[PDB]
Amino acid sequence: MVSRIEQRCIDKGMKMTDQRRVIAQVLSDSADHPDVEEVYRRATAKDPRISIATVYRTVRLFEEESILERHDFGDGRARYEEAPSEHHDHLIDVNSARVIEFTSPEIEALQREIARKHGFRLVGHRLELYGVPL
Amino acid sequence: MVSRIEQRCIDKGMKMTDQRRVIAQVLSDSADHPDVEEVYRRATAKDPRISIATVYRTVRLFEEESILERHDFGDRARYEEAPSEHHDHLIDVNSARVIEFTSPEIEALQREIARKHGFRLVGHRLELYGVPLT
DNA sequence: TTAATTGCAAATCATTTGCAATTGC
DNA sequence: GCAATTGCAAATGATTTGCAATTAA
Ligand SMILES: [Mn+2]
Ligand SMILES: [Mn+2]
Ligand SMILES: [Mn+2]
Ligand SMILES: [Mn+2]
């Protein structure tokens, strides 16, 4: 039983250490959007072998190899998730900072349209919605 | 002698100083979303009687009184004078240029998304990243 | 075998701040 | 004068890195 992230690391050629074994596990099982501090605590939980730097290094390695997506919702720290199958954007509840994920290709179309109407091709974007519940 | 951002500061009731008049002058001149370091380089141009540690306190204070709006783009805080109309940003991954835009449809699809998710939309961030069309 | 990974300081990068000097109003 | 405001320079917090030992292939 290898985590979906672990499998991707193997197929990419990466050396599989004990600490990389767990950090992959952690981020394959994380439903939310943990920060480096939290990915550490969760990894350090499943085995006290890992250090902080290893987690910083490993999460940067993964993001560079398109395994994780980085996020800077604006908390002073960077947050990560396992690269999903299809692109989604993020709805953030300004009351609890819990996160809802949405799609809407209609916006995605309009974005490309807006980029084209300025001389540009769209290489990347970032859409955060902030809202209170009813 | 007087600047638009300096007059907004005299009306708000702040103690006007040589540097704070210069920074108010520099920020009135620019329209390129300059970050703190850049504002420093453009500030000393008018009067070098300013140090780096104050540019922060000024740029932060201005943001407090709502003179400035803050953008933590996808990488160093950049700033601009509080626009009269809301807009998003198209950032050039090819150069320093940054393009301002409004798409009422997007703003409206945003609202529909918050609504159908049982949210009152209280804010949003949008940034598009483009290369010149090849 | 042997090049990549780890762990731990020490070192950044951007921003904040403690405090002695020093303005403004 | 007096409360507010500058200026270093030393703290800051989240991130990176240099280096010697370890470890995966
Ligand atoms: Mn999107
Ligand atoms: Mn997500
Ligand atoms: Mn918008
Ligand atoms: Mn703008």
Give CA–CA dist B4/A91, Å, rounded.
36
| Assigned token pair, B97 | 């240029």
Q: How distant is the Cα of A4 from the closest Cα of chain B, in angstroms?
A: 27
Degrees to nearest 5, angle at CA B129 with B126 and B134: 145
Q: What Å value separates CA B63 and C1' D3?
A: 22
Interface test with A, best of B87, B88, B90 (most A CBs within 10 A): B90
| Three-state DSSP class for residue B97 | coil
Q: Is B113 on the interface with A (CB under 8 A)?
A: yes
CA of A122 to the centre of ligand 3 (A): 17
Q: Is A99 on the interface with B (CB under 8 A)?
A: no
Give burial (CB, 10 Å; 0-12/13-18/19+) of A18.
exposed
- How does DSSP assign A96-114, residue by residue? T--EEEE--HHHHHHHHHH
Which residues have C-beta within 8 Å of that of residue B109, sequence separation ≥ 6? A104, A106, A107, A110
Provide the terminal-to-terminal Cα distance of chain B, rounded to the nearest Å: 47
Resolution (A): 2.8
Give CA–CA dist B44/B57, Å, rounded.
16
Which residue's structure tokens are 């932060």? B60
Instruction: Please state whether beta strands A99-102 and B98-101 pair in parallel, antiparallel, or not at all (unpaired).
Output: unpaired
| Assigned token pair, B47 | 């009067």
Q: Is B10 on the interface with A (CB under 8 A)?
A: no
8 Å CB contact between B22 and B47: yes
Cα-only R_g, chain A: 17
8 Å CB contact between B47 and B85: no
CATH class of A2-84: mainly alpha
CB neighbourhood size of A45 (10 A)? 11
Q: How distant is the Cα of B127 from the closest Cα of chain A, in angstroms?
A: 5
Which residue's structure tokens are 């290489």? A123
Which residue's structure tokens are 């140090």? B51
Protein fold of A85-134:
Dna Ligase; domain 1 (3.30.1490)
Give CA–CA dist B70/A127, Å, rounded.
16
Question: Right CATH number for B2-83 from 3.30.1360.10, 3.30.1330.10, 1.10.10.10, 3.10.620.30?
Answer: 1.10.10.10
Q: How distant is the Cα of B130 from the closest Cα of chain A, in angstroms?
A: 5
8 Å CB contact between B60 and B36: no
Question: CATH assignment of B84-134?
Answer: 3.30.1490.190
Binding residues of B for Fe cation: 86, 88, 107, 124
- Residue B35 CB lies within 7 Å of the nucleic strand C: yes
Instruction: Please state whether beta strands A120-133 and A89-93 pair in parallel, antiparallel, or not at all (unpaired).
Output: parallel
CB neighbourhood size of A77 (10 A)? 12
Q: Is A127 on the interface with B (CB under 8 A)?
A: yes
Domain boundaries, chain B: 2-83, 84-134
Which residue's structure tokens are 């690269």? A83
Asked how this structure was determined, the answer is X-ray
